[PDB]
Amino acid sequence: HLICQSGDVLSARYEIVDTLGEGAFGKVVECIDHKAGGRHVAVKIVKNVDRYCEAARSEIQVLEHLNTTDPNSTFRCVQMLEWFEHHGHICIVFELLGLSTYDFIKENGFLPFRLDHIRKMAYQICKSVNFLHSNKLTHTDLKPENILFVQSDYTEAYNPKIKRDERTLINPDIKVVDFGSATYDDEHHSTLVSTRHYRAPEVILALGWSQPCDVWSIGCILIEYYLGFTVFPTHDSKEHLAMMERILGPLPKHMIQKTRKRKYFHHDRLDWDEHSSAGRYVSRACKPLKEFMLSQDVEHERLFDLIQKMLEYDPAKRITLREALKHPFFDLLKK
Ligand SMILES: O=C(C1CC1)N1CCN(c2ccnn3cc(-c4ccc(N5CCNCC5)cc4)cc23)CC1
CATH class of the missing domain: 1.10.510.10 (Transferase(Phosphotransferase) domain 1)
Structure with a gap:
């Protein structure tokens, strides 16, 4: 429940260009990363709600561990590029994949x-x-x-x-x-x-x-x-x-x-x-x-x-x- 649309900029670097669906957790958007040479990324924007925030913090811990353990993604877990906070919402930046x-x-x-x-x-x-x-x-x-x-x-x-x-x-x-x-x-x-x-x-x-x-x-x-x-x-x-x-x-x-x-x-x-x-x-x-x-x-x-x-x-x-x-x-x- 971050209010947003295409054109909005997150963390003064990620420009929204499309929606990538939603859940009870919040929503995912596709952004242009203006500080990584225009790379398209997926950003998961988590609801400011205790349950989903806690899950997100735990996910961030797990992803940091997995990505450090398997830096080449040999074992095919999605790569987290970084995370940040935006108007109080936890935002997790991923490599952009295709649909589920x-x-x-x-x-x-x-x-x-x-x-x-x-x-x-x-x-x-x-x-x-x-x-x-x-x-x-x-x-x-x-x-x-x-x-x-x-x-x-x-x-x-x-x-x-x-x-x-x-x-x-x-x-x-x-x-x-x-x-x-x-x-x-x-x-x-x-x-x-x-x-x-x-x-x-x-x-x-x-x-x-x-x-x-x-x-x-x-x-x-x-x-x-x-x-x-x-x-x-x-x-x-x-x-x-x-x-x-x-x-x-x-x-x-x-x-x-x-x-x-x-x-x-x-x-x-x-x-x-x-x-x-x-x-x-x-x-x-x-x-x-x-x-x-x-x-x-x-x-x-x-x-x-x-x-x-x-x-x-x-x-x-x-x-x-x-x-x-x-x-x-x-x-x-x-x-
Ligand atoms: O954390 C999750 C799950 C628990 C929600 N992730 C990571 C954040 N997500 C993505 C990461 C990385 N890439 N990525 C691509 C899509 C994606 C791609 C295509 C579509 N479409 C295209 C048009 N037809 C409708 C579906 C929706 C989402 C979604 C994602 C969703 C999966």
């Missing part, structure tokens, strides 16, 4: 990505997020909006199988953004985790969370890229669990035994009515994971073997990103 993977999907009629692009995107996401994991961090908020294309140019053509006209990226290279929720191992882990697009079961059941909850989110990301829509279309925690059970089978009894989240359960089973309005929906929208496959070719079997390991209920059993990078789905890239 969410925005690309929306502008492509919610059609999914092609499997070769998914492979490359999956590999880069696992590599970047594994880098955070090697530096004692958990992202916690991985979703298509927080993965951005480096360059978003595309070509356009009719697809016979899927009914319609389709955009195809020329280069699908990505970077990871949003470090406003990123948490170090030695920091407090909020067991009351706030609103999230994807919610790992150990997060919902409040069993403790750490790096494996990022692996869960990546599994959900990959299925969304594959289908063009999420397999967990809800904002309600109990309904999330109900959808998990249709897609992945019953919650493990040890996780149900351990959880303090008794609101979700009748004795040892989910407290869920399949004949209610919400039950009727869940039953139609959700089905066993492998039934979402669009082909039984070897390549699709390999993606789905990986997704399934990422969506393992038990966060100890769940595949790590180090293991994920060695999975046969990625062999094509290493030939």
Whole structure:
């Protein structure tokens, strides 16, 4: 809620030339940097509101650490150029990227990505997020909006199988953004985790969370890229669990035994009515994971073997990103 338009100058150097979208955090603008030779940059302008200010300060700390640790951006976290304050608002200056993977999907009629692009995107996401994991961090908020294309140019053509006209990226290279929720191992882990697009079961059941909850989110990301829509279309925690059970089978009894989240359960089973309005929906929208496959070719079997390991209920059993990078789905890239 900084009031602004094109022509405004921030920090007496950054001239606004375009909007780059908005959120509950505030807004992003594209600027000309008159003190870096006219370079175009993205500036995130944070709401003067306690919650978003705190996230922003923490993001700045994380970005300074990551960018000092990986000065060449070998691991594809967005580069923060600097930060400043403008009429009391925290402003974070980034290298300018292309649009988010969410925005690309929306502008492509919610059609999914092609499997070769998914492979490359999956590999880069696992590599970047594994880098955070090697530096004692958990992202916690991985979703298509927080993965951005480096360059978003595309070509356009009719697809016979899927009914319609389709955009195809020329280069699908990505970077990871949003470090406003990123948490170090030695920091407090909020067991009351706030609103999230994807919610790992150990997060919902409040069993403790750490790096494996990022692996869960990546599994959900990959299925969304594959289908063009999420397999967990809800904002309600109990309904999330109900959808998990249709897609992945019953919650493990040890996780149900351990959880303090008794609101979700009748004795040892989910407290869920399949004949209610919400039950009727869940039953139609959700089905066993492998039934979402669009082909039984070897390549699709390999993606789905990986997704399934990422969506393992038990966060100890769940595949790590180090293991994920060695999975046969990625062999094509290493030939
Ligand atoms: O902190 C975040 C997330 C949590 C919001 N970041 C960093 C600040 N952002 C950007 C950084 C660096 N580059 N960058 C490009 C866009 C961007 C690009 C294109 C569009 N369009 C183009 C026209 N169609 C609509 C979308 C929107 C935003 C957004 C960003 C957004 C992602």
